[model samples]
Every structure is written in structure tokens, then in C-alpha cells.
Target: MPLKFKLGPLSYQNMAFITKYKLYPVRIPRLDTSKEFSAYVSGLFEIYRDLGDKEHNATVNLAMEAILNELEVFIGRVKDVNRFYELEESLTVLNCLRTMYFILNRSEFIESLLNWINRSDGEPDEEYIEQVETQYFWKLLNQLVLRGLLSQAIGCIERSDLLCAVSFDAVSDSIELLTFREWKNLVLKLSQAFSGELRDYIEDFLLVIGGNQRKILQYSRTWYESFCGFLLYYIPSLELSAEYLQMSLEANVVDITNDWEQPCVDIISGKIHSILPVMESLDSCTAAFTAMICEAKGLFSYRNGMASYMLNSFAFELCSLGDKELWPVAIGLIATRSAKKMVIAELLPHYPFVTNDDIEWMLSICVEWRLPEIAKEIYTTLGNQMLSAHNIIES
Candidate 1:
């Protein structure tokens, strides 16, 4: 026969055993003057060991409540300077208290600690503040994410006004800790639930971790369009908005305006008009040009003359650069604009890597643009290479 034993309800009276031993004091040790708090914490652990797990949990709860009550009262009574140092010194014990709450899985207790720290009347030292925030407050959010309490985590962020508290490292660590599905679900949930600054912060975080450049391009288009619409409303002229949009888009090119301090409107009116700004490097300008070309489609349909000017000017400047390194970029830019054979002929000699393969690529673009003359010109340029290849095959 197996031994039969029934667990009884943990008696509340067992926690008072510390008092019976004169170990439980009515108040916390004199915090500013006392080093005996450690001794008191040690004695609590001793009592914890004597009790069973259930009883130990209850005893720790009662001990924490008493400790917190005493600290609150002491903190309230102390002067500002004294309060700062006192709270600073108490961080270790408070951390231990937080650990106890975490082990007990009592998130409410962790929240209580956060509330106490955040509500302090005096400004705490910056270093100590960061320690508590990252170690305790952020850790709570981390745990909430781990437990699949994403809504609760978002609520905590909003309630505590901790939108800025969400650091890149924390978000990156979450990406590793959460499954991709879990990460997406949580981000989408937060994005929908939050509003204003909180919403923007979450969206920005999502953007940083988005990883898909194509998807990010969609966001860029949305943002740019919105900004353009705003300018159209205030400026009241579609042409002015288009001009500003084109100039702003152009400024993203480092070659166009390396001085970020340059006024965008000035650059658009000056550099773009005079063709002074060119795509000097094979950098973001390539992608920026593609985006501008796409945007030009809608503007052109609206009969926005600035849009036509942007397309024609971008192609002309790129083709005329005479920079062999930029020939491929210039070719793509011109082809996208569907420029006539004259533009292609002008750009053809600029091709630096003029091989059979390069000629084939150029010929394909010319065919796409219906420029047979341009294709003939490309073949003529590569005629010697083509003949040599034919001889090798014949031999």
C-alpha cells in the first residue's frame, strides 16, 4: 500500500514564526544609517528554508510587503538628497525583492516596484535610474513577451509612457527570442492598439526590423506621398509641391548635396535647374532614381510638367556624365524613361564594360524601348569582339 497523505492549507500563522523568534521587526532597519538590512534579508531566507515551498512563498510575500511599506515611509520622510542616495543604496535589496516577485510569477508585484520607482519625488541619479529601468522595468516587458503577453506588454509601455525606453538592442534581442510569426503578430498587434507617438514608435521599430527592402520601399512611397500631399495643401500649387517633392527626393543623393544643411528648395531651384547636381556615386541615387521614376508616372498622368522635366533631366544628366563607371546606372535610368534612340546613342559610348555580354544587355534594353538603331549601334561597337568570338567557334 502507498503512504497516504493529504496536503493541508498553508497556515498564515506559520509566517509569524519569525516574529516569535524576534527576527521580524516592526520596521525596516534604519536605512540611511543601518547595514543590518542584509542581516534581516539573510534571516528571511533562513525562515524560507525551514518552510515548505507553499509556506515559503507566503512568508516571502508577507516579508516583501513589510519591507516595501517601511521603505516607502522612510523614502517619504527623507530629504531630497538623502532620498536619492537612500533609494540608490536600496536598489540592491529592491532588486532582490524583484527577484522574489519574479520567482513567484507575480507580475503585479513587479509592476508595484516600477510604480514606486517612477513616482519618486526627487530625480534619481542618471546611472542608477538607467540600471533600474533596464534591469527591472525592461526585464518585466521582456518576460511579458516571453510569456506571450504581448497586449500586456504594449499596455505596460503605454501606461508607463516608455515608448522611448524600447531600445534597438531590446527589440533585436526580442527578434531572436521570439519566433518570426510571434514577432510579426506582436508588432502588428502593438501597431494597431497604440496611437500617436506610441504608434509611430512601434512602426519605426517595425521598420528597423522589417529586413525586406522591397516592403520598406512601399513604406517610403507612402511617407513621401503623404509629405507631398501636405505640401500641396499648404503651398496650394501642384507644380510647387511637385517641385519640392522632386528636390527633396534629389537631396537624398549624396552627390547632389553632400551638405545636408543645404536648403532643399534652394537645391531644387538651383542645382536641379542648372543640372549642377549629378549622380556622382553609385549609391542610394540608383534606388532613389527608380522611386522618382515610379512617382513620375502618377504626376505625368496629372499633366504635371515638373514631373516630365524631372524624368527628361535625370536621363540627360546621367547620360552626359561621361563617367564609364556610371554607364550601367545611366542606361537603366534612360531605358526606364523610354527615351528615344538619340538618348541611347548618346549614352552608348559611355559603356565602360563593352563586352559581348554588355552589348547583349544593351541590345535587350533597346529592343524593349523599340530602338533598333540603338541596337545596331551597340552591335557596331562590339563588332570586333563578335567577330573574334565567331572565329573561335569556327576554329
Candidate 2:
């Protein structure tokens, strides 16, 4: 309305340009990776160097469990990386990996327990009624049957004390270890053979052997135990597939109390992207490692802006390892991604120059990355610093 030459209101579309990003100052904690976890991260690199077969997966599972356990203990004692006010990522990652480890390693559970029993050296010398009547006896037999190690449970009962009580047995030389149909036949016979609480006990064992999910969850402690137990007895010849995973997941009512269960389900059920931000909260090192590995697997890329951006920050944080000399190694890694030399461009100017040669060294990076603006700034900044150095010597 105030424009002097405006005769009539001119119709025009109003356009507003917004910056690509807003710059907000952030105070990043000093290089926390330091020497403590540097070796740990390197260890992961070696273990993950090349994806091998299932054997490699086995090795990685145990290997990861050890490191994650170590980190859990270390963070517990040192009071860093996994504490309050900081993201509990490292520990939470520990939870998820450990749970995954257990679920994967569930096959070993009965084997290990049986092996322990075979040792005969660890259990108490309590002979007679104590061995047969105690919780120890019941728990062992219950777990063995729940695991559906029928012959093994039969052998265990035979070897110790059951000779004194009314019980079950199998002729070692003459029986096909029961299939689910055979298992149900035995269940019907055993139900009438033993009434009272004794039948109730064997019923749990038989019901589980018949592959009942709902009843199994009742006797189980953790959902992990229930699921693994069900998988062990129900689908011993199971094939892992998306539909299989969902059906198994749906049929089981796992009470998710947050923490690892969230990521574990997503990871196993094949929706990792849904849990991506969850991984970031675990510590920056996790962010870098997962980003690199996921990217290498084609889920991410060297040119990925967010990934490289994290790598850029990761490189600089690596500098905080308290060694003046280690910065280049980190920078070298960043350059491998190369789209982010702007990080090096901005970073190099902040470093101290012992001589003009060092300044020129930085200049070469500027040229290589085509950071002409930064090169120009270095010329001005170093130009003044060098002159100021001379002025100080004279004074």
C-alpha cells in the first residue's frame, strides 16, 4: 500500500526460502571412546571382518556376548557410558545382544545341564531321600522333560533313587524315543497310571511335549525360556522364515517390559529400520559401528549423508583419545567416505601449526577436497598467526 508507484494491488505469489538446515551449537562430550574401548571396537572389526557361515555366526554370538558382558561390568564399575543422564545405549545394546545370544544358544541349555549332571562332581553328597524328594530333583526332571530330552530324563531318573519310588521308565535297548503322537499316547497312559499331584506334575511335562504354547508359558519364568522351550519341543525341526517368525511370535504372549525385548523382536522379526533410533541411543561407537556394517551390507552407504555426518563427528571424537598423533588415522577413515571432507576442512584450521609446513600440509587437504573457502580462511588465519608469532619473538 505504501509503494509510491503502485496504481492497483498487484497479485503475486509470496515465496519464502528456508535454510536447508538450522545450525545449533552442541556440546559433545570429550572423546569417550579413548583407549578403553578402542581395542574393543577393533576386536569387533576383526570378528566382523568378513561374514562367514553359520560357524561364523556362532563365533560372533559368543564373542559378542563376552565383550558386551565386559562392557556391562566395566561401565558398572567405571560409572560411565551406561549411566544416568547419559543414553543407556551401551547397556541396552548389551541386553538385546545377550538376549539374542541366549535365544540362539538355547540349543545348548539341555546339553550343558545334562553334561553337568554327568560330571556328578558338582552336586551334593546328599544320598537317599534328599536326592529324590528335594526341589533339586524335581526342578532338574521338570526342566529335562520341558526340554523334551525324554530318554535323557528317563536315564537320569533310573540312575538315581527312582528305584525307591513309584515312577516312569524306558527300556534303553527297545524303544523309539517318542514322537508327538507317541508322546500323547504315553500321556494318556501316564495320566491314569498316576493320579493326584503326581499326575499333575507329569501332565505339565507331557502337555509341553505335545507342544502346547499356552500351558508352557505358565511354567516358564521368562518369555525367553517359554519361547525357546516351546521351540525346542514343538518345532525341533523348525525352519526360520518371516511367516514362521510371526506365527511363533503371535502365538506366544510375551510380556514386553521394554529394554531389550523391543529391539530383539524387531531384529529377529526382520524390521531393523523400525529400531534404528533405538540403536543410536546406545553410545556413539555403536552408532558408528552399526552404521558402517549396515551400510556395508547395502542398508547404508559411504555417501549416505547421515552416516557420513556421524562418521565425521566420529573421526573428530576419535581425536579426543588424548593423543596428538591419532587424529590423522581418524581423518584417514573419514576421507574413505570423502563426501565429508568439509569436516576435515573445518577441523584442520582449528589445529595448531608448528610451522608453515604444517599449514601447507593443511592447504594440500583443502585443495584435495576442493575446500577453497577453507583454504582461503587458513591463508588469512595462519597469515595472521605467523605474523603474530614473529611479533611475540621480538617483544
Candidate 3:
């Protein structure tokens, strides 16, 4: 008559341990009331306020804090020197540094550090800089190196037309990729290496990448994380800005912003506010994929490889879409849709290939192919509902 006692011995022990201990215990770190923590917090707010209005300041703060927190966690977990110097680790941390430096623009501090590094014949010790990148730190460093190199390289560019013509190629040599930090150090240095003509070329290079500003901005945070320590860095913000300009020109969004300051403000602010969440969501998806890779190498590698291939395909399609003036509609659709069916509805309006009939066929194909897990869930749920109703009728 007693309840079945089929549970394993480990379960009994685990249950005993669970019952013996209280689940909750509060522990707070000791703080000195006389300490300047409040002043530090207030100083941070002041820095934010100085950057722009409450909203822009908040944007930078959120982006910076999120990046810093992630780096803090990442650094804590890094175990070995080999792992520390691993390209991915370096890239990840460098990205955080880059983001911080770009937003905060602490040029002089960055310059001093770079000056010390440049003064030496060899690379800095890898361990001295944490494996994890902090956004504000790297960005500031880059600005410093950029400014420093510009001072010396300016004359070189001005002296010779051929040198100016090939200056960007020469600049590429300065970027070293053996470690992500090395790359960041180089970027900071190279950014400062040349001025005048070379500086102009550097700006042009950035401008080329800026061609997809909104999309780039939307995904900037994740991109920063992925490429944190990579030797060759791409500035998503710069790319996004350039892309937005290109989009504006192609779509004829009009330079109304030039004439109407409020509209301009609205456009920039609206894009930032609207796209940040979208970027965050996309980053979550990428993070999930990355985390999965750490667990299941074979499956994760395949998934990531497929996802990356699809993403590249998507990017190429996107560029092609831009050329044909379809980017606005495509970007707009991708941002709004949640359910796959909803995607079809949103996409069909803007994309000719996704017609009503095409959508219906695609939905059918989902059932036939068991395409996405969501589609499969929908199919199973609807089928179960039908079977339940049939049983009710039989009863």
C-alpha cells in the first residue's frame, strides 16, 4: 500500500540535502559609507548627461554598461594563457574596449598607453590586458593611436602622390592579428599614424563600410562582441552611418533633415531607439548559436556553419536588394515579423517573390519538409486539436 520506492539512491541523498538546507541566504558586501562610490556613480551620470540629451546619454550608458558587464563575466571565466590569447577571446574583449573607446572618446589616455606600446620594439604582455574587451577602453585607445599616427604619417602622404594613392595598403601593414589586443593596439596606433591625405583615405575607407548604417548600428553590439579581439576590425557604427546615407539617397528620404532640424533629430533618434531592441534580439540569437557551439561541436559547428553561410547569402541578397531599391521594404519586413506566417504577410507586400500563392506554398512546404521547429510545433498542435475533437465526437 506504500507509495512505490523506485527512485535511485542518488535521488534520496539529493532530497535529504535539499531538505536540510534553507534555500535563501542574504549576503551583502561591506561598503565604506565614507567612500566615494556615490560620487563615482554621480560622476558617471554627469558624463552621460554631457554626451547629449537624456535619451542619447542613456543609449550610450546602456550600451557601455551591458558591454562592460559581459566582459567582467567573460574575464572571470578565462582559465589559461593559451585560451587567454585565443583569437576569439582577444576579439571579444577588444570589441568591448573598442565600443567604450568610440563612445567615450578618451583620446589622451589611449594615446599615453599607445605611446608606451609604440615606444617598445615588441608587443605588450597579453596577460596585462584582460582577455575580455571593454567597450569604452578600446574605443578611446583607437582614437589616441589614430591621432598619434596621423601626426607623423601626414607629411609622408603629402610628400608623394604615389604614397598617398597606396597609403591605405601601407596602413594595413600596421594592423597585426596574432592576438586581438595586438590588433586593437595597432588600430589605435594606425588611426593616429597618418594625417592629411592618409587621414582622408582612412575616413573614406570607413565611409565605404558605413554604407549600411542602420543595419550595422542595429547589430553593432553583437558584431563588437564577435570581433572583439580579431586583428582586422570593422566599425559597425561607421558602416551603418554610411549605409543609412546610401539608403537615404537611394530611397530619396530627402535631406529634409538638413532643412528641418527636428526631423533630422527624429530620424537619427528614431532609428537608434527603434533598432537597438532589434539588434539586441538578433544578438541573442547569435549568442544562443555561439553557446550551443561550446557544447556540441559537431552539431553546433554544422548549425553555425549553415547559419553563417545563410547569413552571408542573406547579406549578398541584401546588397543586391539595395541596388534594386528593395532594401527599405526588406529591412522593414524583417524587423516587424514574429511568426513565420506573419513574416510572409510582411514580406509579401515588399517582396515580389513572396506573393500570396508563394506564401501558401511555403507554408505547405513547411509541413512537408518539417522545415523549422516552430512550424513543426504548429503542425503538431493543430493535428492534436483535431484528433481531440474527433475523440469527443466519438464519445
Candidate 4:
């Protein structure tokens, strides 16, 4: 095997041709002096150091041309690999080539360096070989990921076993460079290629990034499911878990209760308060609203205060949506929860469809809960309504 790799749109053969003919043979003004070579190398380092936070592309490009030209001349003059390494200038040349590999992303150049190391017949120490691959090869992969060349990064990592050498900090830093679409696609590819705890770690890492609802909505079902799984396992706060659930519902990526099933019930029971705010924003009487309320009701049996507050808020809004049937149920829960009778009275006029029996039931529950003031308020309102009715009949 010739150690196959990928370089985005550029093939290894094309890179070799471009470097060997166009880049390697260029002429620089300085010739055969040690002082001149040192200055030339220093200038190249300065160019590489100034790569970001400023515009050094034109200067670096010219520096690369001159440096590679000098490297070719020096390589031809130094015949033996070990003899070449013996020269003090060889370190400078190696550093220049390493820097240029990142700047140019020339696959052939790196492969050639690896080939030379292998052919050195045990002259290069194992540590030196490890350093070359780790420092140059893995750094190049990080750069590729940052540049959105994910496929190339994947190929290089798989070929070089770079995963064992690359740090999580470096991987995360590179991932931050990706756009939403790029990140999604990269995760999709990674999900297939990576397995075990590594795969799970990567998925969890993305979830914690907490891209806003829109960005999260763009994830494929598989990615979204993984995100939810992480939330269920790792996220302990009910409020935070409910926040993700609300986002998933808003995105319409999955049914709020059915798709998530047990996780859905757990979130609802754990933090109904967190979910209520999101639910309040939904269209009243809609399936999502109905489904969420139904789930809340099942979970709210013990938390009477939460149940009353949620039902009251929902019923008040539903009244505007003409969902009068829920009004008495809401009022009944509010009374049973020992809410003030005035809260029921204030909401009573909104649901004229409430039968006489419903009002009587609410009034009785208020008394049973020892909410005498609330019971009195409801009785007074009902008495006034009847008196007004009798006066109209007399007229």
C-alpha cells in the first residue's frame, strides 16, 4: 500500500506536480552563504508566525516559494539521509517544510517526508518519527477540520491513527470553526465512523454546545435522538431538560410526548413549571397543547399548587380560544388546590358555558378547602347573577 489519503479537491498527484515543478524550482536572490540561509529561514518563520490576525498571505506565499526552492537545492547537495540530518541547517529546513505543510496542505510533501523516515533504516529514532506525525500530521488534520475539509480530515485521521494523538481541546477548537451545516454533516460522518465511548463523547460534546433552537432543529433525526439521549443521561436539572424538550417540540422534530415516550413523561413530571412557559405560547386547543396538558394532568396529581397554577393559566388562555369545556375542570382544580375564590370569579365570566352545577361544585370545593373568603366571593357573584336574572324577568 502507498499510504492513501485525501486532500479535499486536490489529489496527491496534482499536489506533487504543483510542488515539484511550480513551487520547488523557484529562484531566490540569496545564494550559498550560511549567514544568508539563516536570515532566509528567520524571515520564513516571521511570515508563518504572522499568519493570522493580519493579512500575510501574499508575503507568506512568496516566502514559501523561496524556502521550498532553497530546500530543493540543499536536498540535492546533501546526498545521504543521515548525513543530511547531521547538518545544523537541516533542522531549519525540516521546520520550514513542516510549517509549509500547514500553509499549503500539500499531501505529497508530507507523504514524502514519511517515506524518507521509513527509508532511513533505523537512523531516525522512534521518538522523532512520533513527533513528526503528531506535530505535523495531526496539526494538519486539525487545520483541515477548521477549513471545513471534514472528509479529508477523516481520511487522514483514519490512515494515520491520528485520533490517538489528537487532543480533545484541539478537536473542539477546530469544530467551533464549522458552520451549522458543516457541523451537522461532520457529526453525521463521525457517527458512522466512530464507535463506543468516543462516539458518545463527541455526541455529548455537541449537545453541551447548546446551539439555539434553529440550529438544533436542523439536526437529522439521528443526531437529535442522540442529543436527547445525552440530556436524559447527563443533564440533571429538570428545568434544563425541559428547555431542550421545548426546543424539540418547537422544531417539530418529534412529537412532544409520543416520540420521546418515557423521557417525555420524566421531563413533564420533573419540571412542569419549565414547560408551562413554552406551552403558554402555543395555540390553544391545538394537539400539542392538549397533549402537553394531558401529560401535565397525569403528573400533577401530587403537586396541587403546580397543577392549579398550570390549569388556571391554561384555562384562562383557552377561554379566548372557545375551549369552554376545560374551564370548569380548571376552576375545580384551582379550588381544590386552595387558590383564592376571587381567581375563579375573575375567570368565571370568560366561560359563560360553564353549567350551574360546575359553579356549585367549584363553590363547594372552596368551602371544603377552608377557603371561606373565596367561597363567599363566588357565592356573592352567583347571587348577584340570579338577582339580575329575576329583575329582568319582572321587566
Candidate 5:
């Protein structure tokens, strides 16, 4: 005989049995009296808030710079392995202090100082371990550079591992870090890193900067190729052929600036009225995903899920366009959305142009995922739609 379990109404007293351990116990260590970590953290918050304020205060920037200078001198002393053990708390304070300086873009003097340290760190120094441990300097530098803060970006490159890394390392030769004629070949090689999503962004942004069609297209193709490569690796079940994917991209065709393309005349003039900002936002989203992948941090898996959803949603919008007849082969060309198990039940009801292939593809995914009820419903709806369409055609 099988054993049976009884279900009973539960009370708070039953739940009390599970509460044997204390919740929310305070365990954060307080910094020692010799350490000014609290003050450093407080300074960061104050500086961040000041930057948020519309009225720019020069004194706040100057004071922050002074604090950073004071912290750096102390940091230089403790950053040596022997001294660091004795001044660990003070080192923590200095680390926190440096974070604030980087955020505010304090001054070019500090930038030069950071670059000097980065350059000096190439040779094995006594403070080598300490420098590597406090990598906020390099991490934040990369962030600012990607944000197009050119001056701050250059400063960050100097402090970044790129300056000290070997001649063959990714950071060392990264086009993002190179300057002027120092790396003329970098532009051609780095262009390969761009993907379709990034290409869309570069095209729009360059249009604003008075860039011509040929130049913009060349840049866009690089991004499109990169993005396609990434999609192929992560979502291989989609089985997107690299050749068709490449063919889908028209690197030379500048997307018309206006939704209303009047044959040709307003094409150049419509830049001011276009939704270029949204394209910029889309590019940022793609870049964010690229960064997440490049970092390879486990937590970014969730970010990848979100980014994939956004890309599929955009693909849905593309398919719904009234100009679908223009590209008869698009149905076969598009890497199907349902192929990746990205389904939204809400989208089904609102779909303006879902094909039988789309519904069947989605249903098969549901079946594979053990969602029999969803699969059944989708099959039933598809059957009804097909029969109704057939009847209308015969009449």
C-alpha cells in the first residue's frame, strides 16, 4: 500500500516552529577608528548628488579633487604589500574615495596621474597585487569610454590594464583605446566588432555628425556582422544561416530619416524630425548586452534573457510592417522568433500578421517545454483560423 499524507489547516503556532533562527541580525563590521571609510562613502554620495543638481558647483569638484589627492598619497604608501596589511581599513577608505573621483571626472591632472600609475604597473611592482585587487579604476574607465566621454575615456585607457598588458592582448590593441595615427589599422580591424544593432546606431549618429552614406554603411556592416556572430553562438537552435543573415543587411542603404519617405527629396533634410534618439537607445541596449557577454559574469545571464526578449520584440515589429510585400523572401529569411522559445501569450491576441508557420513553431516549443495545455489551445485556434480563411476564399 502507498503511504498517505494528511493536509490540515495551518496556524501561526505551526509556522513558529520554523522560526528557530533569528532574522535580519546585524553583522556588518564597523571600520576601525584609524580608518575614514565612512567619510569616504559619505563623500561619494555627496559628490554624486551634486552632479545630479542642475546648478553646477565648481567648489564641489575642486574639493573632491583635493580629497582624492590626499587619499592617493596615503594610498601610495599602503599600496605597498608590507604597509597594506597594517592599513587595510585606510586602503578601503582610499578605494571608496577613488570611486567618487572617477564618477565626477574630477580633473585631467588626476587622469594623468591615473595613466602614469597604469603605465608604471607594467613592470612587476611591490604594489602589483594591491593594484590588481582595486580594479575599480580600470572597470570605471571602460564604462566612461563606452559612454563617449572622450577626454575621460582617454584618461581611463591610460589607467586601464590596456596600457600595461602585452602587445597581443585584446585591450592593448582595442580600437576603443587607440588614438590618432598611433593605430591607423585599428579602425579597419575594430570595425569587425560592430553588429547590426550597433550599425543602426552608428548610421544615425554619424548622420547627425554630417557623415556620408558610404562611410556610415562601412561602419554599420562591421557591427551587423558582429551582432550576427553573437546571436549564432548563444541561440544556435534558431539555426540562422550566416549567409542569409548577411544578405538581410543592406549596409549601403541609409534608413530613411522620416517614416514618410517622399520618393527621395526629404531624405537628407528629415534628420531633425526622425526618431534617431530611439535608434540610439536601441544601440545602447545592444552595447549593454555586448558588455554583459564580454564580462562573462554569471549574473549577466538574466541580462541576456532580457536583451534577447527586446531583440525578438523588435523583430516582431519589423514583421508587422505594411511593406511586407516589398520583401517577399523575408518570411524565409528572418530567423524565426519562436525558434528560441521566446513566447508571449499576450502578443498572440494583438498579432496583426501571424502565419500558420509562426503558430505551429510556437506550439511545438510549448509542447517541448511540457506546456501541453498551451500547445492544445494554440493548435485549436490555428485550425479554426485556417478553416475560416478557406471558407472565405471558396465563397
Candidate 6:
């Protein structure tokens, strides 16, 4: 065989020269490392760790939401702008994670509803009549439908008499045709009639579904909520691709107040490469993990020296934590030979070793990291120290 006609000369793939700098690296920001943001960093790391482990999607979503909840409390307590600004990245990251969490929360709700019906083992059609009897039944039904939980949305009505169930199924199945004349005419007229109404959650639902953009905004609490309302009704057929998300954000009209918040919009819309600075500003621990998580997912890759920079930066930061045990965690983070040697060299003499095991631990690290000279010096010190122990053993 000629190996697929000489390396497939007629193939459609285009080849290009590998310029080392082609992958433009993000600039790491000078973060204030005095404060303890390690808890928040560890919290952010747990999110990616859980997501990476592919733990239940909804579980990871809930974990991310919880992390934000605690981070928000820290923000309120911080009063100084300069001191406050140090931990400011969390607020923006929280919003991005919360937006994603709510989307999944809706889908998870639908799944739970499905399981409840399955437990009853119903036939061709099933509706939990108890839902309709609940408070704000119409409001709950409309919100379910807007979030694309259609079957449950209809089911919540416990079988409507005025509206045809067959037509509602068609609306969900073929979303391109947003308006069903059976319901559309009724919903539109209902919204207009209720335009004078005040704060009726049920009417807000009808107005949103009827394509009353002006009236929809009146009841929409937040910007993302308002956007979801418009997309659910007016642009029901809109494709939810990355480009779709990117475009919606390009036309964003929300009032952004913080420097950190602006970066989240890009980070939220699948722009992975630009967020290093924001992650860097968050914490050194966060910055390194962000690099690891991004690279792990094959979402993005930075410069060749990125690992060296991020690892060394965090290693230096960890040393300042006044904890000697964190040195090993930082040690393995560094892969670049020269940078590893340089960092260990600086940290070697500084460790306050009280026991021989402490010196032995550093010796093991020196050998593992291939710092032979450091290992040799550690053995020389061990010999003299052990000789003194020999005198004590004789005693």
C-alpha cells in the first residue's frame, strides 16, 4: 500500500507553520496576595474538579451556586475600594455561575417531575392534578413553559378544557411556529386587557408568552431574566449556539459597575482565552487551577511558559502563607526545570525544621525534583545531626 496516496495529497485539510507565539497568552495581573482568598480559590477549584469528574451535572451546578452564595457575604463585609477590589472578582464570577446554574435547575426540575409521573406509571397521558391546586399555579405553569419544560408545563394545568392539549404539544415539538392561533389570539387579547393590571404574576406569564415585549420587561426582574423572556416568546426559534450567545451579549444593555464584571460577560459567552487576567486577579491558587482546568477541557492553551509562570507565582504566594506543608503542593505544580530549581533554592534554607523528619521530607522533595546538590547538603547535615543523636543513644 502507498499509505493513502502519499500522505493524502488531495485531502481538504490545510496546514500551517507553527509560530511559537501564535497562541497569544493572557497577561497575568499583579494580584494582592496579603488577604486569604484561598478558601474562595479552593471553592472555585472544587467546581471545576466536580465538573471534571463528571459528577451529576445538577450536583456540580448546585455546588457552583453555593460557592457564590458564600463569596457574596465576603463582598458585603469588605468596605475599602482598594482592599475590596482585591476580592472583587468573585462577584462577577458568581453571576456567570448563577446564570448557568439556573438554566440547569429548570431542566433538573423537569426531570424530577418526569420521575414523579413515572412512579405513578401512567398511560398515554398523565397530569399531576395536585400542581394545579397549588398556589400561583398559572404563574408556575408559565415559568415552566418559558424555561422549555413543555410537557410538565402542560401537565401542571391538570388537563386544560379551554385549550387543546394536542396544539400545545405541537408548539413545543415545532418551536419555529411560536404562535398557535388557538391560544395565541386568546393570550394576546388577555395580555392587552390585563395591561392595566398591577403585579399579577399570572398575567405577567401570559404577557410574556403573548410576545408583549414592553409588558414582559415590566415584570422581568433582572436583565438575564428579561432576555430569557424575550427569547422564550418572540425569538422562540432562535438557535442557541455559541454564536447566538456571543451575539446576544454583544447587544447587552445592562449597566455594568465593576471592572471585574465586564470580563465575566466574555467568559460567560464561551470566550475561554481572555479570562486568565480575571482569574489571576482572583488568587494565585485560582489562576493556576484556571489554567489547568482550561487546558484539561481542551478549551484553550496559553504560552509555553504559562505553566512556569502560574506555578511559580502560586508557589511563591504559598510560601508567604507561612505554611511549610504547602511547599510540596507548589513543588509539583512546577514542571519547568530552571524555574523549579530557582523556587526550591529560595525556599530551601527558609524552612524552620524542628524534627529530623522535616529535614527528611525536604530531602525526599529535593531528590524527586532532581536537586542533587540540595540533597547532598541535606545528607551532610543529617550525618552531623545523627552523630549527636549517637551520643544521646549511648547515654
lDDT of each: 0.39, 0.50, 0.33, 0.40, 0.34, 0.50
Lowest-lDDT window of 10 residues in candidate 1?
7-16
Best by the TM-score measure: 2
lDDT of 1 by residue, 30-92 (tens): 222223322332233233233333654555555455444544444545533633443533433
Off by over 4 Å in 3: 1-58, 71-333, 336-395
Please write out the lDDT profile of model 3 over residues 1-395, one tens digit for every residue: 22222221121111212323343322111211212222332232333234333454546545454433443344345432432233233223223232323243344334423432233222323522442213333332233233234343333333333534343554545421223445545545544444554354345333222222332232222222112111123332433443333433433223322222222222233332222222223232222222222122111222334333333233223332212233332332232113434434433333333344544554654454344654555457557878999999999
lDDT of 2 at 119: 30
Per residue, candidate 4 scores C-alpha lDDT tens digits across 1-395 of 13322221111111222422343222212112232333433333333334333234444444445444554454555553433433323333232233323233334443433332223222323533464432355334433332233455455555544342333434544454542445555544543443455544454334433332343334323223323433322332334644655555545444353222323233333543443344333221121222322332242443545434454554444344333344444554344333344566455555543578867765665555555665666668778999999999999
- For all predictions, the C-alpha RMSD in Å is 34.8, 12.8, 23.4, 34.7, 26.8, 17.7
Q: Each candidate's TM vs. the true structure?
A: 0.25, 0.52, 0.22, 0.23, 0.21, 0.51
Worst 10 residues of 5 by lDDT: 8-17
Ranking by TM-score: 2, 6, 1, 4, 3, 5
Candidate number achieving the greatest lDDT relative to the actual structure: 6
lDDT of candidate 5? 0.34
Ten-residue stretch with the least lDDT total in model 4: 8-17
Task: Flag the better candidate by lDDT, 4 or 6.
Answer: 6
How much is 272 displaced in model 5, in angstroms?
32
266: Cα error in model 4, Å: 13
Clashes of each: 0, 1, 45, 0, 6, 0
Q: After superposition, how far is residue 98 of candidate 5 from its true place, in Å?
A: 24
**Poorest 10 consecutive residues of model 6 by lDDT?**
1-10
lDDT score at residue 296, model 4, on the 0-100 scale: 26
Tens-place lDDT per residue, model 5, 109-200, is 33433442232222223433444313344333332332223354444345533321232244334434532333434533433442344335
Point out where model 5 deviates above 4 Å.
1-282, 297-353, 389-395
Error of 5 at 82 (Å): 54
**Runs with alpha carbons beyond 4 Å of true place in candidate 1:** 1-304, 320-325, 336-339, 377-395
**Per-residue lDDT over 1-395 for candidate 2, one digit per residue giving the tens place of the 0 to 100 score:** 12112111111212233344433332233324344455545554443443333554565555555555555554544554333323344355434433433335444544533332223122323542365533555656655555444575666666544420333443222223543556556644654454456545655655555556665655554444445565555554334434434544555555454444566566556565545566555566666555553443333434456555555566655554433344444655665335365457656655555566766666666766787877776678768977999999999
